[PDB]
Amino acid sequence: QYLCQPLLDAVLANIRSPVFNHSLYRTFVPAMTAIHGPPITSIPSVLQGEVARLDPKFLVNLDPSHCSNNGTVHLICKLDDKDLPSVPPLELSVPADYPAQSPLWIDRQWQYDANPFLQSVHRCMTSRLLQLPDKHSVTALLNTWAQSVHQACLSAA
Amino acid sequence: MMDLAYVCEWEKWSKSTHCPSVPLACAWSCRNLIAFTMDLRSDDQDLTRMIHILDTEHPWDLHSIPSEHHEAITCLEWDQSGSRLLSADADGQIKCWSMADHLANSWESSVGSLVEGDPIVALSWLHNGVKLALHVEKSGASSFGEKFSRVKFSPSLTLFGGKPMEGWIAVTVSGLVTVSLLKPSGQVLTSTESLCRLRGRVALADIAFTGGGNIVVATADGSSASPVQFYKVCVSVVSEKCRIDTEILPSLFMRCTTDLNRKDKFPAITHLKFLARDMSEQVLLCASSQTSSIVECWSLRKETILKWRILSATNDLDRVSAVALPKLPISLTNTDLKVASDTQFYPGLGLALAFHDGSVHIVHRLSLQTMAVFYSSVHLKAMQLSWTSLALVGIDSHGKLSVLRLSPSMGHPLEVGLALRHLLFLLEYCMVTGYDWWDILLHVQPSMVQSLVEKLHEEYTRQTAALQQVLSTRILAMKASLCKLSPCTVTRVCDYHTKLFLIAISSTLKSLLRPHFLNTPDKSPGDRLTEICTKITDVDIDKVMINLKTEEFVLDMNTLQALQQLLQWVGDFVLYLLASLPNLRPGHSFLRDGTSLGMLRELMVVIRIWGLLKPSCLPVYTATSDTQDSMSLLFRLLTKLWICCRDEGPASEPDEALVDECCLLPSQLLIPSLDWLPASDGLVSRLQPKQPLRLQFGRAPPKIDHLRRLHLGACPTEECKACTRCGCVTMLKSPNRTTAVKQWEQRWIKNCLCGGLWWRVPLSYP
Amino acid sequence: YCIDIYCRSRGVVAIRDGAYSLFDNSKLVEGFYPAPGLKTFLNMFV
Ligand SMILES: [Zn+2]
DSSP states (O other): OTTTHHHHHHHHHSTTOTTHHHHHHHHHHHHHHHHSOSSOOOOOHHHHHHHHTOOTTOOOEEOSSSOOSSSSEEEEOOOOOSSSOOOOOOEEEEOSSOTTSOOEEEOOTTTTOSSHHHHHHHHHHHHHHHTSOTTOOSHHHHHHHHHHHHHHHHHHO | OEEEEEEEEOSSOOOOOSSOOOOOOEEEOSSSEEEEEOOOOSSOSGGGSEEEEEETTSTTOEEEEEOOOSSOEEEEEEOSSSSEEEEEESSSOEEEEEEETTEEEEEEEEEEEOOTTSOEEEEEEOOOSOOEEEOGGGTTSSOHHHHEEEOOOOOSSBOSSSOBOEEEEEEESSSEEEEEEEOSSSOEEEEEEESSSSOOOOSEEEEEEOTTSOEEEEEEOSOSSSOBEEEEEEEEEETTEEEEEEEEOOOBOOTTSSOOSSOSSOOEEEEEEEEETTEEEEEEEEEEOSSOEEEEEEEOOBOOOBOOEEEEEOSOOSOEEEEEOOOOOBOOSHHHHHHHHHTTOOSSSEEEEEESSSOEEEEESSSOOEEEEEOOOOOEEEEEEOSSSSEEEEEESSSOEEEEEEOTTTTOOOOHHHHHHHHHHHHHHHHHSOOOOHHHHTTOOGGGHHHHHHHHHHHHTTSOSSHHHHTHHHHHHHHHHHHTTOTTTTTSHHHHHHHHHHHHHHHHHHHHOOOSSOSSTTSOHHHHHHHHHHHOOOSSHHHHHHTSOTTSSOOOSSHHHHTHHHHHHHHHHHHHHHHHTTOOOTTTTTTSOHHHHHHHHHHHHHHHHHHHHOGGGSOOOOBSOSSOOHHHHHHHHHHHHHHHHSSSSOOOOOOHHHHHHHHSHHHHBOOOOOOOSOOOOOHHHHOBTTBOEEEETTTOOOOBOSSSOOBOOSSOSSOEEEESSSOOEEESSOSOSSSOOHHHHGGGSSSOSSSOOEEEEOOOOO | OOOOEEEOSSSOEEEOOSSBOSSOSSSBOSSOOOOTTHHHHHHHHO
C-alpha cells in the first residue's frame, strides 16, 4: 500500500506477458547477486481402526457370503459376555466412504421372532436406532445392540 | 560380437493376462527414432493400438501415439526421409502420421487410405529414385565422390519433371494391391486392383523396386508346398487417376519339399523378404515347422529365360522368430567382397535371425553361414538393424526393448588404425547423407577419440570447396558429439556449440542489413564489413566505425529493437571471454582463434552503429563507474587480443599489458554468468562396454531459452522444446508474434542448430 | 572501519573491504571510511 504502491502498479500492469519473468530477472538478479552473493549452497483402514479398538465382548468378523474387496463391506459380529445372554449374530453393511455417512443394520425379523425375549431385544434395538444421531459409527450400533440386550434382560426381570 | 547397450522395460504394466499375444511391428528411421507397438493389455485394448516413438538417445522418454486402429497394427514404415510414418492394420486403414509443429513428440495423421475389411499384409513407400553405393575399397581415396556414388536408379511414377511422386503401395490378404499417390497439394489418389485374375490367399507378401520404375511384389499363402508367386506392378497416372498394371513373373517352389527323405516337415513359410528394397532379384524365405526352420536365398538370374535358382540355405535351426535385413547399401561386387573380407568390414553383410530360444545369429547375406552368435541371458519378437548397421534394436516376448551393438568386424580383434578407418568411413557416410551417427558413437572407445577427430578434420580439408561449404555444421556437430566421449576431450564440446551459435548469429546479422544503395558494387555489405574490419586494425571503435558508410547499416527501429537479446549475448560473451583470459574453461579455445575474434569485432562494430541509430538495442553492462564507455573498452581489449592471432604463422602468447587490463575487468564491470549448451543427458557418455543399463520407461536415470536468449523463471510457466542431441531449450510458441525477428526464429523451426530434432518437454507443476 | 565476510563452500571464506561500493567504485558507503593497506595484510595470511 503506502510506500510500496508503484511496484505493485508496475507488476500488476505487466502480468500475462510471456517475457515477464525475463523482465524481473534482468531488472533484479544482478543487484541481488552482487549484494547477497551467489544463490543457495482392500478393506478401508477406518474400519480396521474401529475393529482394532473394540471391546472383547464383540467378535466382529467378515461374512463368508456377500461381495468382498469391493465398495461396501459386510460384517457378522457376535456377542460374548457372562452378564448378557446368547443372541442372534447381527449383520452389518458398511458402505464405502464410511465416515460422513451411517452404516446399515441388515434386519432379520424372522429370527427375532419365536421368543418373547428376542422380540424385546428387537423392539428396544429399533427404538435406540431411531434415537441415534446421524453419521454414527459402527461402534455406536454395536453398543446400542449391547445396551438393548441389557434392557431386554432387565425389563423381562 | 554383441553387447547389450541397454534394456528398457515397462514398470508394472507388463503381465498381460487372459488375452493372447499379437505380432509386433518395429521401424528404425533414418533419424534415430524407433516406432514400435507392444502388447500392453491393461484396462484397454488400445494399449495394444498405441505406437511408441522412442528417440534412441533418451529412451526413458517414450511418446505414445494413440492410433485409432480398430484392429491390430500389422505394418509400420518410415519415410525415405525420417519425417512421416505409415501404419497399417488389419481391416484396411493405412494412416500417414506426420509431425505436429515439427516436434518429434506430436504426431497426427491427416492422410490415409482404406480398403475396408481386407487386412494389409505388406506396405511400402514408393521409391524416390535416390540410391547410392559404398565402395569400401576406396575408403582412403580422399574424395567423397569416390567413396559413395549414386547408381542411376529410376523412381516409380515421375511427374512432370525429374520429381518423383510420394505415395505408398499396400498388398492385402486377398489378391488386392492399392497405390495411393500424394500430390504436392493435399490431394491423394487411390487405386486398388487385383494382382492376378485367379484371386487367392496372400498370407505373406513383400515389395521391392527395380530400375525402370517397376514394383515387384511377392506373394505366398503360407503353405510352403505352394509356389511363391511374383508380380510386376507398374504405376501410372492417367489424366486424373492412378492406374495399376500387373503382370505375372516366374514363381518359385521351395527346397525341403523335394528333399524326399522327410519332406513333410517345415510346412509353413513364415517370413518372405527381399534382401533389400531396390534389390528385387534376391529373395529370402524361411520355412518353419513347430520347432525347426530353414532360411533360403534365391535369385532370379537368367539363362525359360528367367528362372529362380537357389543360392544357399541353412542346415537346421531353431524356430526363427524375427528377421532383420541390413540397410547399409554396400556395393556387393567381387573386389569389394574381397577387400571387406581382408580388412574385416562386416556392417552390410549381415542379417540377424532371432530364434525361439534366447539366441540371435548374425549370418552372411550371400552364403548363409553364421558370422556371430549372441545368447540372451524369452525371445525377440521384433528386430531391426540400424541404418549404419552397427546396432540392432529388438522387442522381446515381454515388455523389454533392448539395443545391441554389433562390432564392425564381428568380434575379431583389429588393430586401431583399421578400426579408426572403419568408423571414419561410416561417419563420412553419415556426413554425406544426413543420417544420424549415434550408433557409431556406441562403438567409439575413449582412447581413440582424439585421433578420430584429427582424421575428420583432415577429411574436411582436401574436398572440393563446395563440400567444405555444405559439410560445415555437420562436422561441427560430429566433432562435438565425438569429443563428448572422452575425459581428456570433454572440455572442448562447449566451444564447438558456441562456435555454431556464433556463426548462427554472425551471418544472420549480416543477413539483416539490406544496403539501401549499391556503393562500391560487387561486394555485399557483409564482405565490405569484413574487409574494412580486417584492414583497419585501429584499437578505437570510433576509427573503425568512421570508415564504414554508416547510412547503409539501417534497420526499421522495430526489428532493431527486437534484436536486443542476441546483441546482449554478443556483448556478454565478449566480456566473459576477456575476463576469462587471465586463467581449461568454457572459453579456452576462442582466445587463440583469430577468425572468431574477428567475427566478434565485426559484431561489436555493427552493434555500435545500431546503438547510435537506436540506443535501446544495445547490451547493458552494470558498470562500477558512470563516466565509462564499456563497448569501447571491450573493443580495445578485443583488438589487442586479436592482433595477436591475425598474424601470419603467429601463435603469439598474449603480453602482460592485456593480462593486467583484463584483470581489471571484474573491477570495472560485472561478469554476469553464461549458459553453455550441451547439458549432457546422452546415454553414450554414460554407457560402458560389458555393462548394460537397465532402465524403466518414464523413469529417467537458471533455466534459459538458449536460442532466443530469454530468461525463464525458476519453474517456467510457458512450455518448451528440447533438442535431442545438444539439449538446448526453447519455448514452444514465440513470446511476441508481432515483434519477432523471423530471420532468426524461422531458422530453427524444424531443427536445432546442432541438427537434432525438437522434442516437447513436460511442465513441472511443483 | 568495515569488513565483509562471506562464508562459502569447502572451508573457504572471502573477505572484502566493506566501506567501498559493490557498484560505483569511487563512492564510499554512508558510515564507513575505507581501510588503507587492508589487501596486503590479508595476502600475508593467504
Ligand atoms: Zn541442438
